[PDB]
From a paper:
The antibody COVA1-16 was recently isolated from an individual recovering from COVID-19 and cross-neutralizes SARS-CoV-2 (half-maximal inhibitory concentration [IC50], 0.13 μg/mL) and SARS-CoV (IC50, 2.5 μg/mL) pseudovirus (Brouwer et al., 2020). COVA1-16 utilizes a long complementarity-determining region (CDR) H3 to target a highly conserved epitope and can cross-neutralize SARS-CoV. Although its epitope does not overlap with the ACE2 receptor binding site, COVA1-16 is able to compete with ACE2 for binding to the RBD.
We further determined the unliganded structure of COVA1-16 Fab to 2.53-Å resolution and found that the CDR H3 distal region was not resolved because of lack of electron density, indicating its inherent flexibility.
Residue numbers in the entry:
A (entry chain H): 1 to 52, 52A, 53 to 82, 82A, 82B, 82C, 83 to 99, 100H, ...
B (entry chain L): 1 to 153, 157 to 211
């Protein structure tokens, strides 16, 4: 299947640059254009520009003229978007997207997973992961709630899974809140049968790519 | 640039309802107008291209029509998994532009929150801070109130999930943070939840 796997999230100081990669597979790289589209948190979609995988000629929206550079390596099927002289309002999820064959058809049939770029003076901190243990006070008629609390981390995001992706039903991972300390805290919870608490192990898998933190915490009853 | 104006901004409809969203272009763009679906946490997804063509693999309940300046997008039978923000996009003239988005929520039956409370873990207390977590699970509609009562009565934070694709509910996480000493001081930790599903506020508590 067609895959566009994008590089990881990162924080950059104002005035610095980011280079976001997008490795493509499952199709003939050079037969397709690649576009870039960005989205600031809680906002709409903004087109940045287009590169021809064949040859590398580029065209950019006026507002990024002079600070965006799109390139591509045809030998690694990778597309690069570099944004220079970063400003606060460059904080966004950046997407690569490919349209169909041209044989003008600019609708994006495939998207990357997005890369959060955060423009900040603050420095990267990994998270502390604490368990929210199932108790009689997190039980409700045979339904028990457990979770884990991912605290004091920067920048966004973290990904949480449960039992390495096996447990998907009943899972809520809440949007991160920005504490007074300038750091983010998040909680992930899951509801399970109270029957399960003695028989099944629950482990939350927290991953913070910017700080290269990968924690696996077992949550057990109190 | 070609502006795209989308309407409504947001809407709530019931499963099975027919839903139509409109896009207007600031000038003639013929039929170079696409529709994308952005579900919570996910990248956008092409549903309709060139005003009316249904992208391959997209359910038949999605349709689009129009030409020139006025376009429509229709969901013929609204499904719970259709919760999302929908965007139009023109490509008649660069720069490619998007509309502002239409947020589509599901209207369902009233659902009261399941309230749970979590004392701070031992590990976190070792570190000198205590976070108490109050969970309001699977409730509808979205408006909910949480008041923290420490010893039966300023620094809590709340967070609401997007509407759940499965059962169309919301969930809410509230966290009260304290120094280890201030936590060890008080005895009763409660969160009092008010919501339309409850005939009266529910207090869920624990004793340290």
């Amino acid at each position: 299947q067609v895959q566009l796997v994008q590089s990881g999230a990162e924080v950059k100081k104002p005035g610095a640059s980011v280079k976001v990669s997008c490795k493509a597979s499952g199709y003939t790289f050079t037969s397709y254009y690649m576009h870039w589209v960005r989205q600031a948190p809680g906002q709409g979609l903004e087109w940045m520009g287009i590169i021809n995988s064949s040859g590398g000629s580029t065209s950019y929206a006026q507002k990024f003229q002079g600070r965006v550079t799109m390139t591509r390596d045809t030998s690694t099927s990778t597309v690069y978007m570099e944004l220079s002289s970063l400003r606060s309002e460059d904080t966004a999820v950046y997407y690569c997207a490919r349209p169909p064959r041209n044989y003008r058809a600019e609708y994006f049939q495939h998207w990357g997973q997005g890369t959060l770029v955060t423009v900040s003076s603050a420095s990267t901190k990994g998270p502390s992961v604490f368990p929210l243990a199932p108790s009689s006070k997190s039980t409700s008629g045979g339904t028990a709630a457990l979770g884990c609390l991912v605290k004091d981390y920067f920048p966004e995001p973290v990904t949480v899974s449960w039992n390495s992706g096996a447990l998907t039903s009943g899972v809520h991972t809440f949007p991160a809140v920005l504490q007074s300390s300038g750091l983010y805290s998040l909680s992930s919870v899951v509801t399970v049968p109270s029957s399960s608490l003695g028989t099944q192990t629950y482990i939350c898998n927290v991953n913070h790519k910017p700080s290269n933190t990968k924690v696996d915490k077992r949550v057990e009853p109190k | 640039d070609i502006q795209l104006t989308q309407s409504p901004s947001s809407l709530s409809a019931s499963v099975g309802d027919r839903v139509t969203i409109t896009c207007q272009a600031s000038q003639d763009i013929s039929n170079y107008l696409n529709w994308y679906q952005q579900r919570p946490g996910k990248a956008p997804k092409l549903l309709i291209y060139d005003a009316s063509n249904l992208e391959t693999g997209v359910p038949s309940r999605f349709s689009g029509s129009g030409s020139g300046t006025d376009f429509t997008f229709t969901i013929s039978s609204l499904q719970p998994e259709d919760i999302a923000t929908y965007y139009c996009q023109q490509y008649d003239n660069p720069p490619l532009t998007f509309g502002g988005g239409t947020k589509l929520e599901i209207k369902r039956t009233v659902a009261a929150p399941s309230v749970f409370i979590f004392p701070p873990s031992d590990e976190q207390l070792k570190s000198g801070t205590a976070s108490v977590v109050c969970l309001l699970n699977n409730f509808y509609p979205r408006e909910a109130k949480v008041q923290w009562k420490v010893d039966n009565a300023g620094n809590s934070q709340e967070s609401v999930t997007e509407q759940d694709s499965k059962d169309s509910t919301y969930s809410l996480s509230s966290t009260l943070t304290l120094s280890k000493a201030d936590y060890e001081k008080h005895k009763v930790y409660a969160c009092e939840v008010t919501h339309q599903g409850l005939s009266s506020p529910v207090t869920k508590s624990f004793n340290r």
